[PDB]
Amino acid sequence: GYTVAVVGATGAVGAQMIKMLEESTLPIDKIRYLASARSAGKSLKFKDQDITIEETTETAFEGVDIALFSAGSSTSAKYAPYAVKAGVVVVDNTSYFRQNPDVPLVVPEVNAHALDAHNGIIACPNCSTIQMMVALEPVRQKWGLDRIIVSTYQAVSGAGMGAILETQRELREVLNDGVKPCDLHAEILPSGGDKKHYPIAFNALPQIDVFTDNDYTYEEMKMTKETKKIMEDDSIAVSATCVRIPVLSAHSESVYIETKEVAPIEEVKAAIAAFPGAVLEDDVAHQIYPQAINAVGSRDTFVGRIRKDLDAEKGIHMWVVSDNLLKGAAWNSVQIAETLHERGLVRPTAELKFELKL
Amino acid sequence: GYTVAVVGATGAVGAQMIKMLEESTLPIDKIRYLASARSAGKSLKFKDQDITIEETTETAFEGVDIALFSAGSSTSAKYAPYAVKAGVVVVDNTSYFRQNPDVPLVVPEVNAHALDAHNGIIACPNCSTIQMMVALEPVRQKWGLDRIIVSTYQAVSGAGMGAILETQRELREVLNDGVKPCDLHAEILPSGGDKKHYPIAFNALPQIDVFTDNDYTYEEMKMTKETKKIMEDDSIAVSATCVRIPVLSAHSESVYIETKEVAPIEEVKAAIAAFPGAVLEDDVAHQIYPQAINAVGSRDTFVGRIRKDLDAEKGIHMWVVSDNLLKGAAWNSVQIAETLHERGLVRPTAELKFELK
Ligand SMILES: NC(=O)c1ccc[n+]([C@@H]2O[C@H](COP(=O)([O-])OP(=O)(O)OC[C@H]3O[C@@H](n4cnc5c(N)ncnc54)[C@H](OP(=O)(O)O)[C@@H]3O)[C@@H](O)[C@H]2O)c1
Ligand SMILES: NC(=O)c1ccc[n+]([C@@H]2O[C@H](COP(=O)([O-])OP(=O)(O)OC[C@H]3O[C@@H](n4cnc5c(N)ncnc54)[C@H](OP(=O)(O)O)[C@@H]3O)[C@@H](O)[C@H]2O)c1
Ligand SMILES: N[C@H](CC(=O)C(F)(F)P(=O)(O)O)C(=O)O
Ligand SMILES: N[C@H](CC(=O)C(F)(F)P(=O)(O)O)C(=O)O
Ligand code: NA
Numbered sequence: 001g002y003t004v005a006v007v008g009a010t011g012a013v014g015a016q017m018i019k020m021l022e023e024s025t026l027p028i029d030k031i032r033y034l035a036s037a038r039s040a041g042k043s044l045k046f047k048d049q050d051i052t053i054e055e056t057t058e059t060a061f062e063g064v065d066i067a068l069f070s071a072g073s074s075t076s077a078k079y080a081p082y083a084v085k086a087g088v089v090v091v092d093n094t095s096y097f098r099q100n101p102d103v104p105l106v107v108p109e110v111n112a113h114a115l116d117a118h119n120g121i122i123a124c125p126n127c128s129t130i131q132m133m134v135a136l137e138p139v140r141q142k143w144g145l146d147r148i149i150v151s152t153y154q155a156v157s158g159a160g161m162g163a164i165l166e167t168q169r170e171l172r173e174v175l176n177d178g179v180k181p182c183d184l185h186a187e188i189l190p191s192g193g194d195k196k197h198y199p200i201a202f203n204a205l206p207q208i209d210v211f212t213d214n215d216y217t218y219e220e221m222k223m224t225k226e227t228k229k230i231m232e233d234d235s236i237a238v239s240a241t242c243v244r245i246p247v248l249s250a251h252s253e254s255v256y257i258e259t260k261e262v263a264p265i266e267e268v269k270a271a272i273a274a275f276p277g278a279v280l281e282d283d284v285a286h287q288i289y290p291q292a293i294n295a296v297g298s299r300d301t302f303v304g305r306i307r308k309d310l311d312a313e314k315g316i317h318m319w320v321v322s323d324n325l326l327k328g329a330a331w332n333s334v335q336i337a338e339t340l341h342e343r344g345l346v347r348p349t350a351e352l353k354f355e356l357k358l
Numbered sequence: 359g360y361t362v363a364v365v366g367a368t369g370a371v372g373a374q375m376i377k378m379l380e381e382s383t384l385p386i387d388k389i390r391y392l393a394s395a396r397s398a399g400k401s402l403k404f405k406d407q408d409i410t411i412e413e414t415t416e417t418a419f420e421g422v423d424i425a426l427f428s429a430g431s432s433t434s435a436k437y438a439p440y441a442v443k444a445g446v447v448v449v450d451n452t453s454y455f456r457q458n459p460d461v462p463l464v465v466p467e468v469n470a471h472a473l474d475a476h477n478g479i480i481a482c483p484n485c486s487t488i489q490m491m492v493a494l495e496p497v498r499q500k501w502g503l504d505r506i507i508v509s510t511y512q513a514v515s516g517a518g519m520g521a522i523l524e525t526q527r528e529l530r531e532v533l534n535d536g537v538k539p540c541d542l543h544a545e546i547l548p549s550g551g552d553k554k555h556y557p558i559a560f561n562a563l564p565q566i567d568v569f570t571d572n573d574y575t576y577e578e579m580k581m582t583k584e585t586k587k588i589m590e591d592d593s594i595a596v597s598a599t600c601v602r603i604p605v606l607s608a609h610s611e612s613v614y615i616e617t618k619e620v621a622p623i624e625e626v627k628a629a630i631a632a633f634p635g636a637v638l639e640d641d642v643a644h645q646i647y648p649q650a651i652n653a654v655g656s657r658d659t660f661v662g663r664i665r666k667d668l669d670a671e672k673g674i675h676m677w678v679v680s681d682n683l684l685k686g687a688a689w690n691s692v693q694i695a696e697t698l699h700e701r702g703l704v705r706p707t708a709e710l711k712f713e714l715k
Contacts, residue, residue: 311595
């Protein structure tokens with residue numbers, strides 16, 4: 001069996017990585033929980049076992065077969081290359097390595113083939129991108145994809161445990177203490193590292209991550225760039241608006257596409273229904289559509305409100321929902337590791353292709 | 359001055375209509391509040407004065423100059439034609455008369471001209487449509503509009519006072535009682551008149567109003583058909599997705615447009631800033647963009663996140679936010695009434711064109 005390390009075991013994704021590992025088929029002989037100096041020394045469960053949390057260091061990866069990283073881009077940049085050098089296969093939840101040509105960017109239902117040529121690091125894509133890829137890939141396979149316009153409705157757990165706690169505090173202050181939403185104090189949202197912070201309670205913040213040079217945010221551009229890499233087609237036009245709403249878990253997305261060929265809606269429905277990891281929830285006669293609260297806890301991606309555009313021949317609208325901590329993060333990572341095992345790809349990489357930052 | 363009646367004075371919109379009238383320049387000699395039998399007798403304030411709520415009947419409109427309706431489509435269906443008969447000018451905040459060719463469907467900043475030929479009824483458009491029209495008209499004036507794609511983030515107050523209280527209860531039960539959002543009991547949302555009801559707490563419900571036979575909701579279809587009427591151009595392609603989110607007040611909209619001619623972004627920002635009723639809130643270097651919680655209480659429509667599409671040369675994305683009970687309803691209605699007064703259009707209609715029921 002494998003020695004498996006979870007880096008960032010204490011965070012929101014880390015907690016779900018633990019759960020998905022507990023429920024995994026992976027033969028695990030030994031598990032290790034790694035975090036920062038803040039959590040080192042504390043204890044955390046794996047099933048019934050007590051696991052002591054260790055500080056993540058350059059030397060902490062000896063004897064490790066598989067390491068799942070979810071501790072921010074900084075941690076992966078510093079330590080993932082040292083893990084590869086130790087002989088680990090890293091599944092990385094951060095954006096740091098995603099656009100590196102030596103790094104597969106994988107949703108297993110879409111591009112498992114990319115895993116075969118890995119060089120020690122597999123990047124888990126952006127959470128909002130992942131669920132959109134599951135929904136759209138069965139459509140692309142049959143009718144092609146020319147463009148995507150997406151507006152997201154994103155849960156706060158994607159910004160981490162602190163953002164979850166901030167959201168609950170703000171809501172409790174409003175609903176129990178009578179504080180006005182605009183009088184709330186915020187410390188993290190919309191973006192922890194950015195200069196200014198705004199309340200999320202009873203609000204909708206059209207900012208996820210920091211702004212880039214082109215007035216789109218990094219989140220919006222990640223949706224653009226990662227889609228093109230995952231689907232291996234730079235010609236797919238993608239533009240996004242990414243918005244944080246008062247939901248703790250599960251991202252929802254209003255997705256518009258134009259296919260290359262006319263895609264009859266009933267066949268699109270059937271195509272999505274038949275695609276692994278995708279579930280059709282589309283019965284408007286009984287008000288059946290994907291809902292964030294129903295998707296929580298499920299590894300599946302739910303698709304409904306499917307209908308053609310009122311004017312554009314090749315245009316289709318839909319509503320896509322998935323648990324952002326599961327398919328958006330921890331489940332996608334564990335599924336990658338299971339696929340690596342299936343394909344006999346869990347082994348050291350001889351040639352190091354990644355800078356050691358010390 | 360005028361005698362002004364508010365029909366549906368006790369509701370969420372009714373309360374804001376009172377507030378907008380209290381803050382209005384309209385010369386009001388006498389104020390009347392109308393509602394159902396359940397409210398008849400009770401008292402509501404107009405500034406410092408005590409006004410007794412009257413039951414709305416087909417004969418209760420004698421002497422009235424202006425009637426603002428926001429009491430449901432069936433209430434306007436039954437009573438507005440009798441108000442017109444009595445010589446009233448009706449400003450209707452329901453969807454009922456909106457597609458009638460004899461009825462102007464008005465956003466004052468956009469199509470005030472349409473008021474001149476009114477036949478006693480002027481329809482206030484759908485809330486989510488209004489703020490989109492305020493944002494987009496200044497762009498259409500200069501570079502035209504080929505298509506609109508819009509995804510909404512709608513506040514629960516649009517569904518009425520009960521939807522607010524249902525949302526608050528649900529959130530309290532999750533946060534205070536540890537009830538999973540899954541297990542919440544709902545009675546109103548997504549749509550009061552529909553068969554099944556779902557929790558909104560920590561959720562996003564892709565249903566507003568009921569479904570039509572083309573799989574779009576009436577809300578999505580209203581944004582389509584009302585846009586075409588307001589902008590007087592049936593050639594504008596409009597497709598919408600309308601979503602309820604856990605916000606009490608103010609609608610947000612992710613709006614994609616394609617113009618007829620390429621519209622330079624700084625000029626688009628300048629045109630929106632210069633347009634009455636629209637405010638530019640767009641300074642990404644300082645994280646400035648419209649926000650629902652900031653828009654509550656204001657008559658203005660706030661526009662930001664303005665940027666060209668990454669690929670379509672004439673494509674532009676933006677973010678539009680307005681208080682759905684103000685510009686979305688009560689303020690648009692009162693502003694209509696003020697515009698009628700300015701244009702000398704508050705007078706009895708000679709020819710009745712609406713069937714008495
Ligand atoms: N409510 C509770 O009683 C409870 C439950 C769960 C989590 N928590 C705590 O709340 C914190 C919230 O985290 P967050 O909002 O900042 O984001 P987060 O995404 O939820 O977690 C970030 C993860 O990255 C790890 N990390 C950060 N810097 C690191 C470094 N230099 N080297 C190795 N790992 C590093 C963190 O470990 P560290 O934990 O050591 O910082 C954490 O596991 C967690 O870190 C956790 O300690 C509390
Ligand atoms: N706790 C709650 O669930 C909640 C809270 C406040 C009010 N309500 C009542 O529930 C009903 C619908 O719920 P909602 O929250 O969506 O209300 P709403 O939209 O905020 O208000 C609807 C308004 O229309 C009026 N109206 C209804 N039927 C009428 C009729 N046949 N003739 C004249 N006026 C009429 C109501 O007056 P009336 O008040 O006289 O009915 C009310 O002022 C309303 O009638 C409202 O009064 C419910
Ligand atoms: N902030 C996250 C998305 C991110 O920006 C991220 F976590 F860095 P990713 O690795 O791209 O999923 C969110 O709102 O869900
Ligand atoms: N349900 C309302 C919109 C409506 O359906 C309406 F109140 F009937 P309208 O008069 O068309 O604004 C909302 O979501 O805000
Ligand atoms: Na194998």
